[PDB]
Amino acid sequence: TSATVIGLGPMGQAMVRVLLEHGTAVTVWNRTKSRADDVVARGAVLAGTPAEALKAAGLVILSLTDYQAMYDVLGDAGEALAGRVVVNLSSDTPQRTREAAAWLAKRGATLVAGGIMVPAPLVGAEASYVFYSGPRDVFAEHEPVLRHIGRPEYLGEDHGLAQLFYQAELTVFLTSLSAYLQAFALLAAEGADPARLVPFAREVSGLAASYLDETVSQTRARAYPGDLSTATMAGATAEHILQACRDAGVDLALPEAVKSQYDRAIAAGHGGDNWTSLWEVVA
Amino acid sequence: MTSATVIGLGPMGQAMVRVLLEHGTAVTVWNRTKSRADDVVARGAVLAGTPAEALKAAGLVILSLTDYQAMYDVLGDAGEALAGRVVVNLSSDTPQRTREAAAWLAKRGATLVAGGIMVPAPLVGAEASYVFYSGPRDVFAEHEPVLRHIGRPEYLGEDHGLAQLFYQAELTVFLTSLSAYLQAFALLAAEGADPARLVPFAREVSGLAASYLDETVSQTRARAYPGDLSTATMAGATAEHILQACRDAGVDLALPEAVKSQYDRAIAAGHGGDNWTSLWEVVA
Numbered sequence: 165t166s167a168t169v170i171g172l173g174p175m176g177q178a179m180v181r182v183l184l185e186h187g188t189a190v191t192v193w194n195r196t197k198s199r200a201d202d203v204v205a206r207g208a209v210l211a212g213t214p215a216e217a218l219k220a221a222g223l224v225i226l227s228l229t230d231y232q233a234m235y236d237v238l239g240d241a242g243e244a245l246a247g248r249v250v251v252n253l254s255s256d257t258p259q260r261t262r263e264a265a266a267w268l269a270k271r272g273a274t275l276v277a278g279g280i281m282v283p284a285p286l287v288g289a290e291a292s293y294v295f296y297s298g299p300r301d302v303f304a305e306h307e308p309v310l311r312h313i314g315r316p317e318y319l320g321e322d323h324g325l326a327q328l329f330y331q332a333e334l335t336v337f338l339t340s341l342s343a344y345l346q347a348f349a350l351l352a353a354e355g356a357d358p359a360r361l362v363p364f365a366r367e368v369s370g371l372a373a374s375y376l377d378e379t380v381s382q383t384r385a386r387a388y389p390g391d392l393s394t395a396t397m398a399g400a401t402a403e404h405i406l407q408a409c410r411d412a413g414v415d416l417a418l419p420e421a422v423k424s425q426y427d428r429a430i431a432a433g434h435g436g437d438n439w440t441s442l443w444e445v446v447a
Numbered sequence: 448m449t450s451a452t453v454i455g456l457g458p459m460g461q462a463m464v465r466v467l468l469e470h471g472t473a474v475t476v477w478n479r480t481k482s483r484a485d486d487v488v489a490r491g492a493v494l495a496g497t498p499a500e501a502l503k504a505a506g507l508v509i510l511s512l513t514d515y516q517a518m519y520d521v522l523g524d525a526g527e528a529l530a531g532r533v534v535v536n537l538s539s540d541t542p543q544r545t546r547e548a549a550a551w552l553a554k555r556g557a558t559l560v561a562g563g564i565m566v567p568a569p570l571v572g573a574e575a576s577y578v579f580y581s582g583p584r585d586v587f588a589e590h591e592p593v594l595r596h597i598g599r600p601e602y603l604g605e606d607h608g609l610a611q612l613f614y615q616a617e618l619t620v621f622l623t624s625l626s627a628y629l630q631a632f633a634l635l636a637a638e639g640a641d642p643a644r645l646v647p648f649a650r651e652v653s654g655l656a657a658s659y660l661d662e663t664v665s666q667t668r669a670r671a672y673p674g675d676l677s678t679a680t681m682a683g684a685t686a687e688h689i690l691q692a693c694r695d696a697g698v699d700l701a702l703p704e705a706v707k708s709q710y711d712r713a714i715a716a717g718h719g720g721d722n723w724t725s726l727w728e729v730v731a
């Protein structure tokens with residue numbers, strides 16, 4: 165089989181190296197042509213233009229920073245797009261993903277939206293999985309090649325779905341990473357060693373994740389029993405974190421935001437309810 | 448035969464009282480809301496009439512209150528009932544206010560050991576339970592054989608602020624992770640998808656985040672942020688996609704805006720090509 169990969173960031177390069185090793189014939193284009201040097205040594209073919217890349221295969225995988233990069237790179241391709249399957253594995257909003265399907269469908273191209281849920285060194289590892297959404301039959305046709313990148317997770321016909329799941333996962337992932345930096349900054353600022361927090365940070369992350377079922381259960385019921393923990397109690401800590409960050413001279417954005425959820429839930433009369441009562445503020 | 452007081456009968460105070468009783472400690476309690484002692488008294492706790500009495504019932508006084516102000520509201524009228532006591536305060540507050548509370552207790556001849564219990568009420572006394580402690584090493588060592596029943600004691604050092612500092616850093620991780628779960632669930636629900644469907648994927652990605660802890664420590668200690676695997680520009684684009692997706696679906700923007708603003712500021716300070724860890728330069 166032949167595949168085209170447009171975008172040779174670490175994710176693009178990992179996908180090329182995987183599809184090559186599984187004996188696919190891979191055509192690449194990149195904005196920065198030099199970054200193709202590695203995958204070309206491994207027998208990827210370098211296209212001169214995006215439109216050239218599109219002509220080299222019926223399966224076109226984009227790994228770009230956002231969906232605007234797709235418009236920037238393919239806006240000029242005209243009839244090179246007709247009959248192509250565009251598998252867009254780029255971050256963007258659900259609404260821009262849905263717009264992109266219409267856009268591509270006017271130029272006679274099919275969108276399959278995806279999101280790869282592992283970093284580049286795990287692409288095509290056992291851990292690797294990818295959300296997909298858009299037309300099932302079209303996806304099914306290329307699933308056999310795409311699967312080398314990771315366990316497909318087909319979500320449905322709405323192109324926005326894979327993107328919604330990706331953005332929901334990355335809210336968890338990026339916000340957690342920011343919370344690690346926040347926790348480390350608070351220690352470092354008070355002269356303690358962030359290294360000493362690590363084992364306890366793992367513990368508390370594992371603990372946080374053990375609340376997922378109760379969060380889903382209570383929020384879908386809009387029922388927030390406060391017997392084990394009140395928004396008043398949790399909100400007090402949110403203020404203690406903010407004040408400790410003010411005292412230590414570290415950034416306030418993240419703890420301000422968390423405190424704001426508790427303050428609005430308390431002002432709204434959920435002081436005696438579970439922390440899940442913040443759903444009444446966030447949702 | 449050992450003796451202990453617990454002041455504060457929220458879920459954690461009660462949890463701690465049942466654990467101590469079940470380990471054969473004599474437990475005297477006081478709560479602002481005397482009714483909440485019903486179950487622990489039925490388990491052999493003694494309900495003191497006043498805070499002053501409860502202090503005199505043991506030399507080991509455990510506080511489980513919402514903040515350290517609650518300790519002032521309750522121990523203000525104590526005076527010399529406080530003389531010679533070990534106050535193990537297991538309440539959330541700032542490091543600064545913990546250090547202040549030590550000085551304040553020492554004027555009334557009482558010793559502070561600050562602690563932070565790192566598990567919820569149901570896991571108090573369970574294998575997973577652990578408690579940060581900081582304060583005088585010899586005083587703490589004296590009451591540790593009773594305290595360790597509540598969970599594995601982690602003694603951090605002499606500075607009373609230390610346990611409060613590690614507690615606040617842990618709850619930064621914990622409370623922000625919970626808000627992030629709400630944020631993710633809100634986004635699915637607003638677009639008519641079922642949050643229940645994200646749960647196993649949300650669990651997996653929390654695991655993935657935690658596997659970055661060592662590289663985060665390494666890169667921020669060095670202030671060295673190689674972007675070969677992930678740039679702040681790429682992670683920042685997604686931070687903006689989250690805020691834009693939430694804006695589109697009518698979900699609260701506060702938490703995604705906080706995260707997106709770290710990326711904006713790191714990129715504007717010239718770290719666009721660096722690792723996400725370069726946000727250290729804006730956060731620290």
Ligand SMILES: NC(=O)c1ccc[n+]([C@@H]2O[C@H](COP(=O)([O-])OP(=O)(O)OC[C@H]3O[C@@H](n4cnc5c(N)ncnc54)[C@H](OP(=O)(O)O)[C@@H]3O)[C@@H](O)[C@H]2O)c1
Nearest residue numbers: 171172173174175195196227228229233254255283677681
């Ligand atoms: N890194 C990860 O761990 C990871 C994991 C899962 C998903 N993702 C997602 O996968 C996608 C790719 O990420 P990545 O980290 O591999 O790389 P990235 O740093 O997002 O770069 C991806 C590619 O996009 C190109 N690009 C960006 N804007 C462009 C534009 N306006 N016109 C033309 N080309 C443009 C870059 O070109 P240049 O090469 O010329 O700079 C690069 O080839 C992103 O949507 C990201 O959210 C990343």
Ligand SMILES: NC(=O)c1ccc[n+]([C@@H]2O[C@H](COP(=O)([O-])OP(=O)(O)OC[C@H]3O[C@@H](n4cnc5c(N)ncnc54)[C@H](OP(=O)(O)O)[C@@H]3O)[C@@H](O)[C@H]2O)c1
Nearest residue numbers: 393397455456457458459479480512513517520538539567
């Ligand atoms: N829930 C958890 O999972 C958990 C886990 C670890 C640590 N913690 C921390 O442990 C402490 C106890 O939390 P919790 O969830 O068990 O309960 P909580 O809802 O904070 O209440 C604890 C106690 O504080 C009392 N209180 C609050 N303000 C007071 C005041 N001004 N004067 C007198 N009493 C006052 C309450 O009295 P009334 O009963 O009269 O209202 C109650 O006995 C907090 O610092 C919390 O951050 C909680």
Ligand SMILES: CC(C)(C)C1=NCCc2c1[nH]c1ccccc21
Nearest residue numbers: 280281282283337677682685723
């Ligand atoms: C969650 C994961 C691994 C799929 C991922 N997607 C792109 C955002 C991102 C990811 N891994 C990262 C690691 C650092 C910064 C952003 C990262």
Ligand SMILES: CC(C)(C)C1=NCCc2c1[nH]c1ccccc21
Nearest residue numbers: 393398401439564565566567621
């Ligand atoms: C992290 C843990 C379990 C020790 C904890 N400390 C007090 C804040 C708090 C805790 N667990 C909670 C669960 C819900 C709301 C607040 C919570």
